[PDB]
């Protein structure tokens, strides 16, 4: 009874157990939540022959 009660209380206090994959996913989600930085007016070509 004492050991079982102590284990019950400890498991209740600690909560569910997570692995390294969960923490890595949480960090990646944190970096994803900041959102992309949309910079306009970036060039999508380069000139091999400029108009003249």
């Amino acid at each position: 009874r004492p050991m079982l009660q102590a284990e019950l209380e400890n498991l209740q206090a600690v909560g569910p157990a997570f692995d390294l994959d969960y923490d890595q996913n949480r960090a990646m989600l944190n970096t994803l939540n900041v959102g992309p930085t949309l910079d306009p007016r970036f060039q999508t070509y380069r000139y091999l022959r400029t108009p003249e």
Binding site: P40, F42, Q43, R46, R49
Partner: protein, 156 residues
């Protein structure tokens, strides 16, 4: 008079993609980490240039460029039919010639105006216009892919 000007383009450099490149790379990383989709896909510069080439040859892009070019607006008589005919003619003035790598010929664009300075300036402005449209479309695509990835990660 019918003067003509020519431009030849190629894929952008890494430095001229600004931050966009890096952002796109980040998303690609995730597509490699989960839901294997690399398959030695074309680089970010290749996709950006593909979008730019799609915008350059687009009929809608030429129409919208001419509608705000201040060179079409001067040649407007106030008659809807004549204005539409002139707009169609000037849309047909811009021509895109795709290139194939077999004979080492690149994509080219030719513009036709009534004077040489006009033929030069209008072609420069049209290339800038198409590049800006392609950049905006790429930014929208990046936003959509980022939102989808965020939703998937939240669900996981």
């Amino acid at each position: 008079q019918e003067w003509s000007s020519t431009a030849i383009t190629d894929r952008p450099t890494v430095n001229m993609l600004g931050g966009y490149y890096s952002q796109q790379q980040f998303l690609r990383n995730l597509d490699v980490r989960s839901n294997m989709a690399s398959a030695d896909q074309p680089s970010v510069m290749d996709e950006a240039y593909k979008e730019f080439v799609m915008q350059l040859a687009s009929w809608d892009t030429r129409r919208e460029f001419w509608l705000q070019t201040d060179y079409y607006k001067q040649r407007m008589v106030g008659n809807s039919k004549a204005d539409a005919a002139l707009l169609d003619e000037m849309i047909n003035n811009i021509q895109f010639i795709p290139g194939d790598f077999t004979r080492a010929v690149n994509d080219s664009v030719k513009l036709i105006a009534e004077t040489a300075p006009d033929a030069n300036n209008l072609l420069r402005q049209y290339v800038a216009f198409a590049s800006q449209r392609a950049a905006s479309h790429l930014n929208d695509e990046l936003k959509g892919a980022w939102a989808a990835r965020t939703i998937q990660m939240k669900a996981q």
